[PDB]
Design brief:
part of a larger assembly; 3 chains; A alpha/beta (about 220); B alpha/beta (about 130); C mainly beta (about 70); B: about 130 residues; 5-stranded mixed sheet; C: two-stranded antiparallel sheet; elongated
Chain lengths: ~220, ~130, ~70
RNA sequence: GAAGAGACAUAGAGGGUGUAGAAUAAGUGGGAGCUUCGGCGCCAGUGAAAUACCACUACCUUUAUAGUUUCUUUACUUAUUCAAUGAAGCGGAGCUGGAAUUCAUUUUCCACGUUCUAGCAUUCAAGGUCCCAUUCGGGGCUGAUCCGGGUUGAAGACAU
RNA sequence: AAACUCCAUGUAUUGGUUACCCAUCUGCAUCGAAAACUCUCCGAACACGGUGCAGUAAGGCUUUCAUGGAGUGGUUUGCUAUUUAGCGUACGUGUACCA
């Protein structure tokens, strides 16, 4: 069951977006976030998952993604407009996990190859997967343009020890109807994945990234 | 200047009690007997057991706030010996050796008038 | 380990006006709380103290005052 | 009703150790931005973690609003229970007498016509004072303080 | 007589870092004898303590072929006011410990 009052959430979204756009304004590409909590949920004893939902458009069009793979997907990434690297260097670079964590922080999302599934868990395993941006390998025959656009419009659900899961949704510079569609589809998917449906979720607070404190529910 | 407790050494035969109380006597601080320091059952009243018992009392008298003691020496009293045991002198001496100041040492052996019948019979304990 | 001595209040004891210096000594009691309070456990205490302590003169080394 | 031990709501805290960076770091994704500082973070080193902004707050104690399904204890009386009597003097306040070393504060507390004697104790009670219309007598008040109409005692949300 | 514990080079997935190996919740075989009636035997007994197996992983679910090299021998749970120590000093399991 949808426990959301549609007219009230539409008015709340329109006033929040008016606040983020017209009352206050900055060139900072702000990112609206859904930080959904958990009530009467025990993360440790209950089975979890790492899942990937899709979005109608990019939550933030200035989000960097990196690729590792063969020279073919390297040149495809060059046509894409995203930086590409080799894999022999990473074999030496496995030693400094500090530098691996630094590069994982600098490149906040990674993608790999079906041949790189051989070498990834021994070299790029620990720090990158601790960062949790799980690389889904691309297909050389499939469209790297399409895969880049997919990663532009992906959402990663990583239910961890904390009971508050927070993921970005969109922006303010783009349109608003698709943003409302994004928030509504995200809460519907979260309600569907929750194993007690609306009982686990306790609140749904969206806040314009540079804004004040308020509680929706 | 000095925080005062009451030492209350019970020095009978067969044992020795070092029972430091508060100044009013109601609250107990470190009652350590001679049987708590040696396990031989014939030297519980011995001076060595009493000196160890007294210094363990002074070990807890410090780190609670007690820096000086009023000493009350006790034999068995009643219809019994009225003479302090061999361990009262060692326990009293060890309290002074441990840094706890002393004041108004007093003998508080319970002394009857003539009283109920002492045990032993008419011919007494004959061995 | 319990250590019941870290939970007492360390009061102070006075003397009546019919004496010399009236600081007799401290008293270790309990922290007064609810559920069988330890405030009235200080109403009936009896203290034996020498008169020379209460007067400062050794001429009353005997006559302990209750 | 009151007190204590609560818990759940309540609304606001802040803070939280190794390492080692630019802070004694348990947190999110951020790529640069509100501005009293060109200060903080940023492309920079080095850190299990990048740092303004918490935005949901893991985990909170501390409160003062204001709480409600409790657990114990302690009180109240009006349910219930017990007893008595021809339901006669209960409770509160007084007046008097005393003790109170009044401090111009009933501040306090006791007493309230009876104890040598197997007598007697009743006629709305005599007296005093007021009014009769006083027709031989009659009626008030006081005698015999006032007030509350809770008969009195026990017990009590236990017991039954 | 030699055996086995570990690191690296890495082949299928050995995978998902508070990183296989922190792992225990749980069941399934029992570590054999005090210098004991000297010893020994069978039997009443479910084991007289750690390893092995599985379902449960504060990594999402199997342990994968291999090779090279580092590597041992002792202190015994006790008694006694000789206590920074004086006597006494079973083996089979892991501890504590050393060089």
């Amino acid at each position: 069951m949808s426990k959301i009052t549609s007219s009230q959430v539409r008015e709340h979204v329109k006033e929040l977006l008016k606040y983020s756009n017209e009352t206050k304004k900055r060139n900072f590409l702000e990112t609206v976030e859904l930080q959904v909590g958990l009530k009467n949920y025990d993360p440790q004893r209950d089975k979890r998952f790492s899942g990937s939902l899709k979005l109608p458009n990019c939550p933030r069009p200035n989000m960097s993604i990196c690729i590792f793979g063969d020279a073919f997907d390297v040149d495809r990434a060059k046509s894409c407009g995203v930086d590409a690297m080799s894999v022999d260097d990473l074999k030496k670079l496995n030693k400094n996990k500090k530098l691996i964590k630094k590069l994982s922080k600098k490149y906040n999302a990674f993608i790999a190859s079906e041949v790189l599934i051989k070498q990834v868990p021994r070299l790029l395993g620990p720090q990158l997967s601790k960062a949790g941006k799980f690389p889904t390998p691309v297909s050389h025959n499939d469209d790297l343009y399409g895969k880049v656009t997919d990663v532009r419009s992906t959402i990663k659900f990583q239910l961890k020890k904390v009971l508050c899961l927070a993921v970005a949704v969109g922006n303010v510079e783009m349109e608003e109807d698709v943003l409302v569609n994004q928030i509504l589809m995200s809460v519907n998917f979260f309600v569907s994945l929750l194993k007690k449906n609306w009982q686990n979720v306790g609140s749904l607070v969206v806040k314009s990234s540079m804004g004040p404190a308020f509680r929706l529910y | 200047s000095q925080v005062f407790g009451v030492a209350r050494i019970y020095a009978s035969f067969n044992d020795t009690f070092v029972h430091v109380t508060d100044l009013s006597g109601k609250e107990t601080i470190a009652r350590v007997t001679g049987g708590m320091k040696v396990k031989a059952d014939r030297d519980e009243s011995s001076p060595y057991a009493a000196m160890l018992a007294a210094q363990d009392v002074a070990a807890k008298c410090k780190e609670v706030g007690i820096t000086a003691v009023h000493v009350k020496i006790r034999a068995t009293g009643g219809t019994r010996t009225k003479t302090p045991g061999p361990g009262g002198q060692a326990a009293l001496r060890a309290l002074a050796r441990s840094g706890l100041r002393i004041g108004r040492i007093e003998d508080v052996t319970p002394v009857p008038s003539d009283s109920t019948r002492k045990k032993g019979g008419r011919r007494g304990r004959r061995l | 380990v319990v250590d019941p001595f870290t939970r007492k209040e360390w009061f102070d004891i006075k003397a009546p006006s019919t004496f010399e210096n009236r600081n007799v000594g401290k008293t270790l009691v309990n922290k007064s709380t609810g559920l069988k309070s330890a405030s009235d456990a200080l109403k009936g205490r009896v203290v034996e103290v020498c008169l020379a302590d209460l007067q400062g003169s050794e001429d009353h080394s005997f006559r302990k005052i209750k």
